[PDB]
Design a protein around this ligand. Structure first.
Ligand SMILES: CC(=O)N[C@@H]1[C@@H](O)[C@H](O)[C@@H](CO)O[C@@H]1O
Ligand SMILES: CC(=O)N[C@@H]1[C@@H](O)[C@H](O)[C@@H](CO)O[C@@H]1O
Ligand code: NA
Ligand code: NA
Lengths: 403, 403
């Protein structure tokens, strides 16, 4: 394959999701849906009476479900959150303003999302493709928590002052908005709960938002495939437009990102409704894109595999990353994986490389890392692999407590 | 070798009384397990609880294990509508044990809300290895157990649909339990599928007389309570315990994991000078003395994270022995000595997953008649076997029979 494409759909489950899923199924591909469960409560200001049906269909069809937060941070778009808050924020269009405030409350939205999903579909944890507690993506934000050495934020994703299209819009990555700072904290809080978060390389969106029925201008399949070709191995998270979609410090050439393109789009762009005739005009674009992308040599995969699963029989080079039972690991020495030699907290063959900050066992800590342990912060003074006896509060030759 | 292992477990914190309890534990040189209800942090649990957050921090900093007792102790099922006054309202009626469990999905959800609230008031809590809020739980009112695949049992008269156990005409039929009890059984199962273990108790350190105006005063004295512990050692107390609503009728008497162990249940608020009596003045000395004389008698104290012994390299295990590893229960396949690189996992040849859960899972030894959930459907295990990736219930209609 010349590459791997990860189709990722945000903001479902809504009525529009149903036909999208069927197009994916007809195309013989799996995708990842980052869901907001407020649609299940009927307060997300979309056609969403089939929300539960859509959730069931995505899961029964084998697509991966991940976590986009319960309400898409709309509680930060309004004064008091309630059943009309989606409509109100849609009225004002202030989604990108003050999007993140209290990072603790905002992170908690991701856990509430789990509660609501498991309320409406009590059997959801019986699905191996339910990944709501492992894979997340922040609203508005092209941010990444993939490995210890693959993390980067969307430094101008959201704003404190005014929406980005306007004269005088200021974006300083070195001194980001309050909303962006808070969102960075949200990322860290999720990573410490074991989440990975992923941004995107290309955004399948209206070419022109100013025309009537803007959804109709979704990029046609042929030129969209052109965008994907251009993104392939080109660190497009740094070059993408608009500015609020950029990942300024994305680690270009990082090994896990090679030969891969993550596509972001939205289920709601594919319905005939308030944004245009998205079903009529866009379902065929999705279908054709899948076909021509395969013709060109691409294969489609899902985000649970973006970090490849540890696999018995495969030989690994030192430095390579795998995902095993939800945890990221990096090979310590080159070897061939065998049944009893899986990654773990005690394996000599692997170290834990989750994108987290809480002190953890079997991590290869580097000079300058800061970890949290029993409510305090510690600076790593000497590189080493962590172990049970070497806790930060008892190893002053390895850690120094910060103020 | 020690006479046995005692597990001190305190329920219904964190409250003011918890602080001095913790200090006594520390002076006694022991660790305990606190099953907390986080509503006290919100100041609506109708206790003296302005120091709730102080008590939580102290418990964790002191190395005690924090487990999950649900957010509101199911008080939402004691009143028509849950709110800031419900704790008080339920204490007025004394109907805690009636209709205690109703909608098991909502009730289970209270355990996850508990995590949100704990991680709200103490945002650093996940940096404590002794925070086990997402791994260890205990149901309100209920001597019920989800420990391993072959160590689970319910409190079949723990809660009632009408009368309380002491009221005339009250009937307990374990063979046809109350609707409240049936709901609680489903709650146990939901939690198990989220990776929780739940544990009941062997002895309950409580008023010897609830009919006086200061019942806390009659808490069993240290010496006779130690006599209760001796009595409970290896004698299947959960079956013989009184009152009837504290029984675990089908507890697996003699099960190896319970050998030479006694779990003590008590409550932080029994050690308070307050509405229940002079608990701090009279009972803190009882606790302190108990610890001292128990140790003198040859007992050692441990916590519930070790009740199922943690896997440790260099230790020898026998076929059928259980360990806990990274929060997951495993059962040894053959006699062997644990090595660094050979840890229990989903692919190990030396171990099988033996979590007390019902969702289909890799590397589990399934018995005939087991019922597993998979992608929203239920399946009877028709052919006992050890599960593997290629033998999913939806593709294996000889091993499994759809229900
Ligand atoms: C112009 C447009 O389609 N905006 C939508 C908004 O309506 C929606 O509530 C939000 C969360 O789903 O996503 C986007 O910001
Ligand atoms: C008699 C007594 O102390 N009952 C308490 C009740 O007051 C409390 O609200 C509940 C939850 O903490 O636990 C017990 O049922
Ligand atoms: Na993870
Ligand atoms: Na567990």
């Amino acid at each position: 394959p010349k590459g791997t494409i990860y189709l990722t759909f945000d903001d479902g489950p809504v009525n529009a999701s149903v036909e999208v899923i069927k197009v994916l199924n007809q195309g013989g591909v799996k995708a990842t849906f980052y869901f907001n469960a407020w649609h299940l409560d009927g307060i997300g200001d979309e056609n969403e009476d089939r929300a539960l049906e859509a959730l069931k269909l995505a899961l029964d069809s084998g697509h991966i479900v991940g976590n986009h937060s319960y309400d898409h941070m709309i509680h930060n778009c309004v004064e008091e959150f309630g059943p009309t808050s989606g409509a109100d924020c849609n009225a004002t269009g202030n989604h990108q303003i003050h999007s993140y405030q209290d990072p603790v409350r905002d992170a908690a939205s991701f856990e509430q999302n789990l509660i609501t999903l498991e309320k409406y579909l009590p059997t959801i944890r019986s699905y191996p493709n339910y990944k709501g507690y492992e894979l997340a993506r922040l609203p508005y934000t092209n941010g990444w928590r993939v490995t210890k050495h693959f993390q980067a934020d969307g430094l101008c994703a959201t704003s404190d002052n005014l929406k980005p299209w306007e004269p005088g819009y200021v974006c300083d990555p070195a001194n980001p908005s309050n909303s962006v700072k808070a969102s960075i904290q949200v990322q860290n809080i999720l990573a410490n709960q074991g989440y990975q978060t992923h941004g995107w390389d290309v955004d399948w969106a209206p070419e022109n938002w100013g025309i009537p029925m803007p959804a109709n201008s979704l990029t046609e399949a042929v030129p969209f495939l052109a965008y994907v070709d251009k993104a392939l191995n080109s660190c497009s998270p740094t070059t993408i437009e608009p500015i609020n979609s950029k990942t300024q410090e994305f680690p270009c050439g990082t090994p896990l990102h090679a030969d891969k393109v993550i596509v972001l789009t939205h289920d709601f762009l594919f319905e005939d409704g308030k944004r245009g005739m998205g079903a009529t005009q866009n379902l065929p674009k999705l279908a054709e894109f899948i076909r021509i992308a395969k013709e060109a040599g691409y294969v489609f995969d899902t985000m649970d595999n973006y970090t490849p699963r540890w696999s018995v029989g495969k030989t690994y080079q030192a430095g390579e990353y795998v995902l095993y039972q939800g945890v990221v690991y990096k090979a310590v020495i080159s070897h061939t994986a065998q049944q009893d030699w899986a990654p773990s907290s005690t394996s000599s063959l692997w170290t834990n490389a989750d994108p987290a900050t809480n002190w953890t066992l079997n991590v290869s800590y580097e000079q300058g890392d800061i970890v949290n342990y029993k409510g305090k912060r510690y600076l790593v003074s000497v590189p080493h692999v962590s172990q049970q006896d070497w806790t930060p509060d008892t190893q002053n030759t390895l850690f120094t407590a910060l103020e």
